[PDB]
Design a binder for this molecule. Structure first.
Ligand SMILES: Nc1ncnc2c1ncn2[C@@H]1O[C@H](COP(=O)(O)OP(=O)(O)O)[C@H]1CO
Ligand SMILES: Nc1ncnc2c1ncn2[C@@H]1O[C@H](COP(=O)(O)OP(=O)(O)O)[C@H]1CO
Ligand SMILES: [Mg+2]
Ligand SMILES: [Mg+2]
Ligand SMILES: [Mg+2]
Ligand SMILES: [Mg+2]
Lengths: 191, 191
């Protein structure tokens, strides 16, 4: 099976192609952050919208949400969202899904296929929001480092986030708890 | 709350201090790999040992299993396992747990405390094994890159892994599925 190799190979997939970064980011670091953000958003959403989400499936979906970029590489959204490329890249992403996991036990094989082809719309939407939050946070850290080239990136991500908070109250709550002073200049928790 | 800041601050915590690495590894990359390994080990263990594990708690424990290293930094095991430092570092790790998460909702606060102070012994043991597997895998990748300085590291980690496979059949199965040709020289799945 290639599955363990793929998990480590995600470190070789860079994000933010074409932008100067003070800190280079790979898909594994991004996915770690998306898992944690997805968990936090889930807890907030459960309490506000009065429900219980299946966190096993949510966390596993977040964990593997970008695993196909080991084949496609990471195509930045200004490129992937172009009308010329939008549908073909989703079709390509779908082709990678249907091919990735071959030499496994049916316990793993079925469970891996279930995760990749997940049709739980709410879990997909939570991870999509977590994905946007993480992109915003990265842009905040770069700006904080002094990277003027991410100012316009932070602004458009922040504008899209603001609009999402008007429609998803759990995102507004997340914004209020964490995204108003981010990152922290004083990491008091270290001392 | 410092929780979101801490999630990103784990990128500033390096592993393998005092060893030459061709690729520098941080706690976020390591934790991503441990989450995925913990999931795979859990599926194998469930099938072999005839049970169902609560994967929500397992994955969340793996996710945060090294979060206290944002305060302690990452102390390598030859140092932390010295008889002089063994108990004090665990006491220190415990002090960090009881202090980390302050300004949260009780939904988050209680859930975060539950995860950190988890007393499910089996979940702790799965993550401990995943942690050893990840260390072995890192050592395999470095050796594969040509890093002769990790040969003796790979050997001792491999020896400890071999002994663990004699006592935990799900680890032997994992070894048979993934750890016999690792990493792959031919990443055929990319093409
Ligand atoms: N303004 C931007 N300029 C350049 N790259 C960007 C920008 N915004 C995002 N990226 C990169 O595309 C990746 C994912 O972005 P996203 O998740 O926020 O957008 P969607 O794919 O969800 O539409 C992100 C890092 O490479
Ligand atoms: N032989 C070694 N030489 C130097 N550093 C090591 C070695 N083995 C492990 N490390 C580093 O200690 C970290 C964790 O190791 P571990 O998880 O396998 O050992 P335990 O803490 O579980 O006893 C690891 C990377 O920094
Ligand atoms: Mg996105
Ligand atoms: Mg993503
Ligand atoms: Mg360990
Ligand atoms: Mg660890």
């Amino acid at each position: 099976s290639s599955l363990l190799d793929i998990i480590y190979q995600l470190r070789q997939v860079p994000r933010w192609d074409g932008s100067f970064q003070f800190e280079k980011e790979d898909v594994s670091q991004h996915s770690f952050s998306v898992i944690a953000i997805s968990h936090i958003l889930c807890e907030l959403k459960e309490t506000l919208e009065g429900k219980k989400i299946n966190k096993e499936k949510l966390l596993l979906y977040a964990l593997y949400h970008d695993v196909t970029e080991v084949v496609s590489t990471h195509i930045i959204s200004p490129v992937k969202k172009n009308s010329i490329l939008k549908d073909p890249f989703n079709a390509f992403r779908e082709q990678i899904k249907n091919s990735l996991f071959d030499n496994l036990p049916i316990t793993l094989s079925d469970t891996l296929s279930t995760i990749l082809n997940n049709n739980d719309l709410e879990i997909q939407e939570i991870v999509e929001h977590a994905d946007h939050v993480d992109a915003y946070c990265k842009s905040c850290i770069e700006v904080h480092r002094g990277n003027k080239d991410f100012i316009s990136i932070q602004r458009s991500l922040g504008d899209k986030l603001d609009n999402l908070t008007k429609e998803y109250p759990y995102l507004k709550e997340f914004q209020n708890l964490f995204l108003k002073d981010f990152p922290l200049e004083n990491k008091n928790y270290r001392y």
